[PDB]
Amino acid sequence: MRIKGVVLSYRRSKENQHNNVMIIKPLDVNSREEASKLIGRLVLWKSPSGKILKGKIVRVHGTKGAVRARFEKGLPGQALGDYVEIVLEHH
């Protein structure tokens, strides 16, 4: 299963762990429960660089089902409105 989402916003990782954060609103996930069972799942975002960065849903945002994912590559984008695919990893 891959869930389709819209990156509402990005956050520049100023931390030691340079993992580019994003406020994703999954079109299928509009409940807190459906979002909370996605903690750890692998999000595939398409960077403007023409690369598919892999990320991890670290925590959800409210009851809206909007998930917040940190991407290992930590590469910028500012592609506000771009689409992701949340791979139901389940480790």
Curated annotation (Swiss-Prot):
Q: Which GO terms describe its cellular component?
A: ribonucleoprotein complex; ribosome
Lineage: superkingdom: Archaea
Q: Which InterPro entries match?
A: Ribosomal_eL33, Ribosomal_eL33_CS, Ribosomal_eL33_sf, Transl_B-barrel_sf
Q: State whether keyword Ribonucleoprotein applies.
A: yes
The molecular function terms of the Gene Ontology recorded here are: structural constituent of ribosome
Query: What single Pfam family name could you report for this chain, choosing any that match?
Result: Ribosomal_L35Ae
Gene3D superfamilies documented for this protein: translation elongation factor selb, chain A, domain 4
Is Methyltransferase there in the keyword field? no
Q: From its record, what is one biological process in GO terms?
A: translation
Q: Which UniProt keywords apply?
A: Ribonucleoprotein, Ribosomal protein
Q: Subunit structure, briefly?
A: Part of the 50S ribosomal subunit.
Q: Which family does it belong to?
A: Belongs to the eukaryotic ribosomal protein eL33 family.
PANTHER family from the UniProt entry: 60S RIBOSOMAL PROTEIN L35A (PTHR10902)
What HAMAP family does the record tag this protein with?
Ribosomal_eL33 (MF_00573)
Query: What's the protein name?
Result: Large ribosomal subunit protein eL33
Q: Which organism is it from?
A: Pyrococcus furiosus (strain ATCC 43587 / DSM 3638 / JCM 8422 / Vc1)
Organism classification: Archaea, Methanobacteriati, Methanobacteriota, Thermococci, Thermococcales
Gene (UniProt): rpl35ae
